[PDB]
Amino acid sequence: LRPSGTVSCPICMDGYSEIVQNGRLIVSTECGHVFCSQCLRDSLKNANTCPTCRKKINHKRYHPIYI
Amino acid sequence: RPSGTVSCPICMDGYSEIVQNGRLIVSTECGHVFCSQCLRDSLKNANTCPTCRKKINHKRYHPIYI
Ligand SMILES: [Zn+2]
Ligand SMILES: [Zn+2]
Ligand SMILES: [Zn+2]
Ligand SMILES: [Zn+2]
């Protein structure tokens, strides 16, 4: 059982207290998707995208300049 | 309220009260959580997080060194 309206990680299936009492953090992507810190890091080892919605969660900070 | 409560500290509305009435839970980049409406309201007159006061309005311009 995984009630709607509760904080949990969809990867490891751990709830809020299980996550924080083990020394992990709750994290969010910028697209609003919530994970535990360990699961999202493990995910980003094999992919640059959000596990949930697959939006790119890397951002390279450079841009064209027009002289 | 207690650890694991998703609520806005400004209006004090709990999770259910926020999302069911067309607002959203929002987080600043500094990890601080509010309802969409209270955070937006605060950002109309200040550029900083209401909780930790980190500046959270970026500057989409910068020097270029040529
Ligand atoms: Zn997890
Ligand atoms: Zn996402
Ligand atoms: Zn609020
Ligand atoms: Zn903050």
From Swiss-Prot, chain A:
| Entry comment on modification after translation | Sumoylated; conjugated by one or two SUMO1 moieties. Autoubiquitinated.
Q: Which stretches does the record call RING-type zinc fingers?
A: 9-54
Organism the protein comes from: Rattus norvegicus (Rat)
**Lineage summary:** Eukaryota, Metazoa, Chordata, Craniata, Vertebrata
The free-text function statement in the UniProt record for this protein reads: E3 ubiquitin-protein ligase which binds polysumoylated chains covalently attached to proteins and mediates 'Lys-6'-, 'Lys-11'-, 'Lys-48'- and 'Lys-63'-linked polyubiquitination of those substrates and their subsequent targeting to the proteasome for degradation. Regulates the degradation of several proteins including PML and the transcriptional activator PEA3. Involved in chromosome alignment and spindle assembly, it regulates the kinetochore CENPH-CENPI-CENPK complex by targeting polysumoylated CENPI to proteasomal degradation.
Q: As annotated in Swiss-Prot or TrEMBL, what is the tissue specificity of this protein?
A: Widely expressed with highest levels in testis.
Per UniProt, subunit arrangement is:
Homodimer (via RING-type zinc finger domain). Interacts with GSC2. Interacts with AR/the androgen receptor and TBP. Interacts with TCF20. Interacts with PATZ1. Interacts with TRPS1; negatively regulates TRPS1 transcriptional repressor activity. Interacts with PML (isoform PML-1, isoform PML-2, isoform PML-3, isoform PML-4, isoform PML-5 and isoform PML-6). Interacts with PRDM1/Blimp-1.
**Mutagenesis / variant outcome for changing residue 9 to S:** Loss of ubiquitination activity
The record lists Zn(2+) 2 as bound by 31, 33, 50, 53
Q: What is this protein called?
A: E3 ubiquitin-protein ligase RNF4
**Binding residue positions for Zn(2+) 1:** 9, 12, 36, 39
**Free-text note on domains in this protein's UniProt record:** The RING-type zinc finger domain is required for the ubiquitination of polysumoylated substrates.
Localization recorded for this chain is: Cytoplasm; Nucleus; Nucleus, Nucleoplasm; Nucleus, PML body
